[model samples]
Target: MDVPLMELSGRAPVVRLHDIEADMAAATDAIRSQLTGWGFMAAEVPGIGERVEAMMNEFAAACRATGPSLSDYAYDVVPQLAVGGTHGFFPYNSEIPRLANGVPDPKEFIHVSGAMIGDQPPGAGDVLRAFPAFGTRAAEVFDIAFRLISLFGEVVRGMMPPGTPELDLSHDATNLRVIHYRDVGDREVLAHEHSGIQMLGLQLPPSDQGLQYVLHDGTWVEPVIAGTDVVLCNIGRMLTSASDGRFRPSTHRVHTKPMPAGYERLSSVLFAYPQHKARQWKMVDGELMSLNATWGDFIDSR
Candidate 1:
């Protein structure tokens, strides 16, 4: 089972960790090697999905309170305004002008980030305040992210070519997002080929044909994981740059998988970003190449 199936671009490899609190070596090795091969990897944390599933249920309940405001769930960033002080839950693609009825109950999502976790940012704080358990869940997700990113950093540090500066990732931000696919029949790819996010931690439910990404050879495929095993990780744009393209982030998009009558789709996502001040640089061949802009500057473009 360690070897991915022949199909599925070799399948997103899985890294199993019984306890992220205690086992770093195994997780590190698994992540270190997996990221080297694929743009994404599946990591199983015993009972991880359950805790997250509980949180998703809470979020779904709150969202329904708004009469399914499709716009409330779609969030997009204007590159100019996304630098700093831009954090919290928002909606995007609300006005799909092309469609007569606006993409027919278009898919929407709500997202909040740790940028204002400590009670800063008026709008952001208000968003977190909306969900009493949202803060708690965000903290839990951030904690797990910190641990995994810490281990990943350690692995990458040791793997870095000699004389390369130590990787600076002290300020990675984690975001919590719940995408609501109002109807199962709407067929639209919400995202396109691009690598701009830092790292994506996805929680998978029992379903099929929702996520697909372009492989190195330009082939598109999906991930296969069993029930209950959670925490799917995708390398992102910043990491790709930081790794000197050693780890090109996954170019992924979402499409709905047909569901039984009355069933809808909701996705729980955790997007992590590097510190605003952190510089993007990586070693290629033997040269240490660096980018001109800070992480904050580089982020908005993607």
Candidate 2:
């Protein structure tokens, strides 16, 4: 008898949000299977791609201007008085080392905490005024993130046991980040190959190809998106833990080789977190382990 070999699809499964809304049971089953098996799925969310692309392009153009430096709008100097979460611009080479080996990831980005708008933190207006081009667009992105979070709650409810409480959005620690990878001739930009810390993550379309995820068998696959409106959704470490290992967390990274001169990469992602005061628990060795800390405490420890 001849030996048989398993075949890998080499692509992420795609799910349409509207389809889920129309047929909850079937769509939920498909989403649950995708999360359990692949830990990632491409979500067809209307208009998200075009909006993110326009926002990124506008921000990129603003960064190249000779006026006030983007760093001037950094949260460090913005007096985020009473702000519950971190936000604002992070300049190139200023972020913490992503790799365990202490090599800093080569990228610049801005974080817009969901709390900024949800709580109306102090200095929020200043940060918005500083980036006029991004103000309205950022708000729109936040709205989209909120919608996704609500949808995520519905999916989670379907996956979990009966009587599970709905996700509380009040005082949420969710956030949106816009990343810009500068042209670094031949050098590989090795972002940490790791799982996300939040419960879920929604990745918008990138200006170029680079994002990749590893399979259970250690095969790396770069998902090919069919449309600009398709957003990539991934289960994160928190969800994996919450589900007691039922849902897998996607292990992914951004690795880019040499690019044409002047070529830069742009992308955006929204991390969905629970409310700050929500309790978290996990299962270890078939035993429930109470973390004994609120969601805010957990994030602070990270």
Candidate 3:
């Protein structure tokens, strides 16, 4: 099911692998076992399980506070999220999608949850490269979280389909950043600067997120949902601005979930801002010059 996801004005890339049937089941089973094994069910582990529970509780409470349900929405964010605290950081190469003329390619990102839980070595990131596909094994969720940063690097970035979107990163291969949020109902969202000047990341609305698009004057927009399982390469603010006459960072939002009275809603989102970690000079060479500060300093600054 390799389909090119596009829109007229602006849009964020999205693809629901579930449509792929076999791949979807495989991916779901892979994630479920990992989440459970990772202690998402039992609070036996130390910080991992606790964090998951905390995220679920807060999400449920937020729903109660405003009325909603706990659900996993990974449209605008790219990598899937397990309703709770488990989110997939960057796990794919950006350059694999858009062509030389910004045209996107099919089958850009791939899915792999066979080992994403438990105590494992690092996989993606600037420092290491590995895999943690958790399949039917729920005891390894923490393991998946521990080294997910590598997913974007070890697995996602390195597996781009020929020519993909490479921001300032031409040499290095690490995540540009991982942005988070409060899942606040229609409230002001918070996207970090970690994504860099390469692109601007936005959160999905909590309602029927079919396709998050924005109307003129309105700041909110719909994100594009491509039918794939791996990752949904999104657009950045820089690309949108550079278009001058075209291109846009599809405004999208999480679909609002329905809450059953008295029950808690568990919502987990695995959002990844995967990017090839590049040296300062690479980014400086392109545009967005005046990116003062060293990599160490930037990390420290964060």
TM-scores, each model vs. reference: 0.74, 0.82, 0.29
Residue 189 lDDT in candidate 1 = 54
lDDT of 2 by residue, 41-84 (tens): 55555556778888888678756756656777776865453525
- Count steric clashes of candidate 2: 0
lDDT string, candidate 3, 111-138, tens digits: 2222223212123111112211112212
Q: What TM-score does model 1 achieve against the real structure?
A: 0.74
* Candidate ordering by TM-score (highest first): 2, 1, 3
After the best TM-score superposition of candidate 2, give how far the Cα of residue 75 lies from its true spot, in angstroms: 2.2
What are the root-mean-square deviations of the candidates from the true structure over C-alphas? Answer: 5.5, 4.9, 16.8
Higher-lDDT candidate among 1 and 2? Answer: 2
Worst 10 residues of 3 by lDDT: 37-46
Please give the clash total of every predicted structure, in order: 5, 0, 79
